[PDB]
Amino acid sequence: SKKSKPGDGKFGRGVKRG
Amino acid sequence: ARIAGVEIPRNKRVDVALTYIYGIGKARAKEALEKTGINPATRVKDLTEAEVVRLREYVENTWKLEGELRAEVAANIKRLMDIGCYRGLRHRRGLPVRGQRTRTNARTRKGPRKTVAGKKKAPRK
Amino acid sequence: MLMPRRMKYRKQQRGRLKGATKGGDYVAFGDYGLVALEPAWITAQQIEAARVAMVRHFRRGGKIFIRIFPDKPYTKKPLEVRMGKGKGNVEGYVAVVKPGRVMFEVAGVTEEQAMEALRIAGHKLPIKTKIVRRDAYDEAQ
Amino acid sequence: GKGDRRTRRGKIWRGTYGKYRPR
Amino acid sequence: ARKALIEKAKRTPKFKVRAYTRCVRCGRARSVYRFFGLCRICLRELAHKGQLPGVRKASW
RNA sequence: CGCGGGGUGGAGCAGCCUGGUAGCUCGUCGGGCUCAUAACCCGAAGGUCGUCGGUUCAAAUCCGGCCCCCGCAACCA
RNA sequence: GCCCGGAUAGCUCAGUGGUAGAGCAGGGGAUUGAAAAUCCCCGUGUCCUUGGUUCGAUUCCGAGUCCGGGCACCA
RNA sequence: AAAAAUGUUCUAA
RNA sequence: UUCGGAUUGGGGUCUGCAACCCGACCCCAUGAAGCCGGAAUCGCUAGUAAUCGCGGAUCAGCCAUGCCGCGGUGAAUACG
Ligand SMILES: [K+]
Ligand SMILES: [Mg+2]
Ligand SMILES: [Mg+2]
Ligand SMILES: [Mg+2]
Ligand SMILES: [Mg+2]
Ligand SMILES: [Mg+2]
Ligand SMILES: [Mg+2]
Ligand SMILES: [Mg+2]
Ligand SMILES: [Mg+2]
Ligand SMILES: [Mg+2]
Ligand SMILES: [Mg+2]
Ligand SMILES: [Mg+2]
Ligand SMILES: [Mg+2]
Ligand SMILES: [Mg+2]
Ligand SMILES: [Mg+2]
Ligand SMILES: [Mg+2]
Ligand SMILES: [Mg+2]
Ligand SMILES: [Mg+2]
Ligand SMILES: [Mg+2]
Ligand SMILES: [Mg+2]
Ligand SMILES: [Mg+2]
Ligand SMILES: [Mg+2]
Ligand SMILES: [Mg+2]
Ligand SMILES: [Mg+2]
Ligand SMILES: [Mg+2]
Ligand SMILES: [Mg+2]
Ligand SMILES: [Mg+2]
Ligand SMILES: [Mg+2]
Ligand SMILES: [Mg+2]
Ligand SMILES: [Mg+2]
Ligand SMILES: [Mg+2]
Ligand SMILES: [Mg+2]
Ligand SMILES: [Mg+2]
Ligand SMILES: [Mg+2]
Ligand SMILES: [Mg+2]
Ligand SMILES: [Mg+2]
Ligand SMILES: [Mg+2]
Ligand SMILES: [Mg+2]
Ligand SMILES: [Mg+2]
Ligand SMILES: [Mg+2]
Ligand SMILES: [Mg+2]
Ligand SMILES: [Mg+2]
Ligand SMILES: [Mg+2]
Ligand SMILES: [Mg+2]
Ligand SMILES: [Mg+2]
Ligand SMILES: [Mg+2]
Ligand SMILES: [Mg+2]
Ligand SMILES: [Mg+2]
Ligand SMILES: [Mg+2]
Ligand SMILES: [Mg+2]
Ligand SMILES: [Mg+2]
Ligand SMILES: [Mg+2]
Ligand SMILES: [Zn+2]
Numbered sequence: 228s229k230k231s232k233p234g235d236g237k238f239g240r241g242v243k244r245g
Numbered sequence: 246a247r248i249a250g251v252e253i254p255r256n257k258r259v260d261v262a263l264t265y266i267y268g269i270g271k272a273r274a275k276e277a278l279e280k281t282g283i284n285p286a287t288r289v290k291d292l293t294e295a296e297v298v299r300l301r302e303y304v305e306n307t308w309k310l311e312g313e314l315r316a317e318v319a320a321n322i323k324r325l326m327d328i329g330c331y332r333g334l335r336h337r338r339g340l341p342v343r344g345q346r347t348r349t350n351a352r353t354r355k356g357p358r359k360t361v362a363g364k365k366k367a368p369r370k
Numbered sequence: 371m372l373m374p375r376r377m378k379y380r381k382q383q384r385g386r387l388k389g390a391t392k393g394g395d396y397v398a399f400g401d402y403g404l405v406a407l408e409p410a411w412i413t414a415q416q417i418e419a420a421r422v423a424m425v426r427h428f429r430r431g432g433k434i435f436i437r438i439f440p441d442k443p444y445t446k447k448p449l450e451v452r453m454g455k456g457k458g459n460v461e462g463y464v465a466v467v468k469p470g471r472v473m474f475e476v477a478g479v480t481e482e483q484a485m486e487a488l489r490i491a492g493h494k495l496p497i498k499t500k501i502v503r504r505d506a507y508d509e510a511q
Numbered sequence: 512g513k514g515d516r517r518t519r520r521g522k523i524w525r526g527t528y529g530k531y532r533p534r
Numbered sequence: 535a536r537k538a539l540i541e542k543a544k545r546t547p548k549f550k551v552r553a554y555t556r557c558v559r560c561g562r563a564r565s566v567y568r569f570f571g572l573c574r575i576c577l578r579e580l581a582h583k584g585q586l587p588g589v590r591k592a593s594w
Numbered sequence: 595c596g597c598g599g600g601g602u603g604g605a606g607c608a609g610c611c612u613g614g615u616a617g618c619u620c621g622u623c624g625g626g627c628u629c630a631u632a633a634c635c636c637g638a639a640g641g642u643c644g645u646c647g648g649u650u651c652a653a654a655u656c657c658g659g660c661c662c663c664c665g666c667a668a669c670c671a
Numbered sequence: 672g673c674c675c676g677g678a679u680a681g682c683u684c685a686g687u688g689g690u691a692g693a694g695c696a697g698g699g700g701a702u703u704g705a706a707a708a709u710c711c712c713c714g715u716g717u718c719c720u721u722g723g724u725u726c727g728a729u730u731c732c733g734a735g736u737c738c739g740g741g742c743a744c745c746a
Numbered sequence: 747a748a749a750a751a752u753g754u755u756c757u758a759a
Numbered sequence: 760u761u762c763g764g765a766u767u768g769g770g771g772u773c774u775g776c777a778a779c780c781c782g783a784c785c786c787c788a789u790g791a792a793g794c795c796g797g798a799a800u801c802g803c804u805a806g807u808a809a810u811c812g813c814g815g816a817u818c819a820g821c822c823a824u825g826c827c828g829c830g831g832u833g834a835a836u837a838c839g
Contacts, residue, residue: 236699261761270788271761314788318768331779342767344781344822353766353791360624360638367702367709369631370754371732376647380659422723422733448595459595513824514764516785521764523812524824529785549776551819565817 248301249310255290259300262289268310277304371414372440373463381457382443385411391471396511397504399435400475402484404491407498411464412473414440419494420474427487432479437472438465467497536561 228237235242246252253262263274278285281303283296292300304310309317325333335342341354352358387409397403404420417440424434440463447458467473474491476484485501492499513524522532543556543563555566557573565574572580580586 233700242700258761264761268788270790272787308788314768318789321768336767345766358624362623364710366631368754370708418723418733426722451595456595512763516764525784527784531786551775551777553819555817567816568818 247297249305251311253289255288257289258286259283259289259292260285263304266304266311268308268314269304273308277307280307371418372436373414374441377443380443380460381445385442385466387411387466387468389468391468394437394472395470396508397472397475397502398437398508400433400477401479401504402476402481402488403472403502403504404474404488405500405502406467406469406471406473407500409466409468410495410497411442411444412438412440412467412495412497413444414463414465416494416496417465420491423490423494424474424476424487427490428476428479428483432483433477435475435477437475438467440465442466472502473499539563 228235228240229242229244231241231243233242234240249266251266253265255262260271260274260278263269263277264271269277275285277300281296281299283292283300287296322336326336327333332342339354339356340347341351345351345354347355391406417436417438421434421436428434442464443460444462444464445458446461473495474488476487479487481503488499488501492501512518513520515521516525517531519532522528528534540556540561543554547553554563555568555571556563557566557576558571559576559580560573562573562575566572567574567577570577570586577586581589581591
């Protein structure tokens with residue numbers, strides 16, 4: 228639900244956090 | 246069983262036969278022969294037992310060798326695994342020690358290839 | 371259920387049941403015992419029925435000693451066959467038990483608790499029995 | 512051979528100098 | 535991580551070793567030519583415009 | 595506890611008779627060819643032989659008991 | 672009345688003494704333009720009750736309940 | 747005068 | 760094997776605030792696999808291929824055996 232790939236299950240958003 | 250425990254091959258020059266002793270590469274053979282006055286080019290079967298006992302004495306005492314060197318090498322590796330340092334763990338797991346890649350190489354350190362199954366490609370359809 | 375792990379021979383001839391028990395006639399381990407008054411072949415099934423009755427009467431408490439062992443193979447022909455053609459097949463195991471044998475003992479339990487448990491135990495058995503407590507005669511042996 | 516650091520050949524390869532190839 | 539790294543490369547660092555080039559045109563960290571202060575792309579862009587003194591597509 | 599046969603890589607079959615040896619086809623795994631799959635070609639792995647007991651220097655193989663799986667039989671009344 | 676067999680996740684079923692798997696259903700990731708398929712990850716449970724053996728039992732032994740079935744004129 | 751099978755759904759920009 | 764120089768022990772040097780993870784280099788010692796490579800498969804028609812070394816960009820250093828260039832030596836064969 229955060230920045231880039233892979234996806235965290237929310238649309239558009241990924242697992243990487245800042 | 247001449248020197249030290251090693252029967253160094255006759256029919257070869259001294260400087261080379263000496264290398265057949267665990268602990269003596271080409272450079273140390275250059276010393277012992279200079280430091281004891283034997284021709285580096287004399288075939289081993291052609292050494293006077295004066296030269297033999299001369300060379301044997303210096304070789305056997307200047308540096309440490311076949312079985313003792315092996316034991317000091319062993320104690321150092323043994324030491325690293327005991328303290329539990331990084332090089333120690335890489336000796337336990339039998340992996341490379343000097344920072345090589347292990348993704349794709351290291352067969353000297355790892356052994357023959359233990360091939361396992363791979364991820365399957367999907368079928369069509 | 372009890373039975374021998376191994377046997378030298380599979381089938382045994384039928385016994386005789388003469389005389390008082392050979393040994394095991396005195397309380398050996400516990401405080402109270404159950405004594406045979408008649409001879410019989412006691413079955414593995416009967417022995418296990420007496421044991422579980424006492425176990426549930428102690429609600430797992432106390433100790434139980436089985437001082438008989440069904441080592442004797444008990445043979446039986448299939449139903450509706452004629453005589454002959456060799457001996458029937460082993461169908462279970464019995465313990466030979468002559469009068470005066472201490473078959474069971476209990477310990478670590480109230481007298482009242484032992485008495486009841488040995489009474490119930492006795493109702494599983496095909497012989498008259500007796501309850502006993504360990505006297506000095508038992509300790510003299 | 513070129514992988515042998517201990518020769519005038521291997522120092523020519525790794526572009527280094529030393530006892531085994533001085534200057 | 536773009537603009538705050540455009541700035542950071544300018545700042546004089548806590549240590550000499552932490553210095554690094556960036557394209558002064560686009561900000562690229564990689565393929566930065568010292569002579570121009572430019573990455574290999576901006577180089578090819580400004581070149582083809584003739585905005586780069588004396589630079590000319592070589593051939594031989 | 596009528597008689598007969600069977601139990602061995604994942605599947606289907608050899609090996610047993612005649613004690614010292616595990617074999618064949620498919621299948622599985624790795625690599626080739628193909629744009630790609632299949633066919634095809636090159637390699638590899640996997641069975642202590644239903645089970646317990648005995649005989650033997652040695653048991654899948656010989657002998658007993660147990661489990662299981664097919665088959666056959668049950669006539670005169 | 673007596674004999675055999677079944678009971679484990681929401682559903683269909685594996686499992687041979689140290690409380691456990693699968694498939695399928697649903698969701699997410701990878702993959703895709705988006706799907707199908709394939710691969711990964713996630714939630715699933717007093718393993719029907721009761722007694723016993725055991726340090727320990729879904730697992731071995733007995734019973735019970737429910738279901739599912741089996742007995743056999745006679746000349 | 748031809749060894750050799752096949753290419754999931756919707757979309758064709 | 761005076762072929763090969765991987766791996767490991769020890770001892771140094773340098774760059775760098777700093778080389779445990781994770782640098783290059785030096786010297787002692789160690790001295791693996793490898794005896795020309797299954798099915799299969801790539802490049803090149805001439806100063807080419809093959810073989811030899813040199814330089815530069817990046818860059819403190821460097822994991823470059825990579826890349827872009829440079830000249831030395833210099834073939835084989837094309838019937839169709
Ligand atoms: K008749
Ligand atoms: Mg990833
Ligand atoms: Mg951040
Ligand atoms: Mg040596
Ligand atoms: Mg590494
Ligand atoms: Mg399908
Ligand atoms: Mg009799
Ligand atoms: Mg008398
Ligand atoms: Mg008696
Ligand atoms: Mg006595
Ligand atoms: Mg009876
Ligand atoms: Mg009888
Ligand atoms: Mg008889
Ligand atoms: Mg009988
Ligand atoms: Mg009675
Ligand atoms: Mg009394
Ligand atoms: Mg830098
Ligand atoms: Mg830069
Ligand atoms: Mg089988
Ligand atoms: Mg066959
Ligand atoms: Mg045969
Ligand atoms: Mg044979
Ligand atoms: Mg075979
Ligand atoms: Mg394959
Ligand atoms: Mg295409
Ligand atoms: Mg294919
Ligand atoms: Mg048998
Ligand atoms: Mg045997
Ligand atoms: Mg045997
Ligand atoms: Mg054999
Ligand atoms: Mg007739
Ligand atoms: Mg009835
Ligand atoms: Mg039942
Ligand atoms: Mg899905
Ligand atoms: Mg996820
Ligand atoms: Mg996408
Ligand atoms: Mg999607
Ligand atoms: Mg039960
Ligand atoms: Mg059971
Ligand atoms: Mg044809
Ligand atoms: Mg088809
Ligand atoms: Mg050598
Ligand atoms: Mg050499
Ligand atoms: Mg070292
Ligand atoms: Mg480092
Ligand atoms: Mg050779
Ligand atoms: Mg070749
Ligand atoms: Mg051409
Ligand atoms: Mg060469
Ligand atoms: Mg260069
Ligand atoms: Mg550099
Ligand atoms: Mg490295
Ligand atoms: Zn730029």
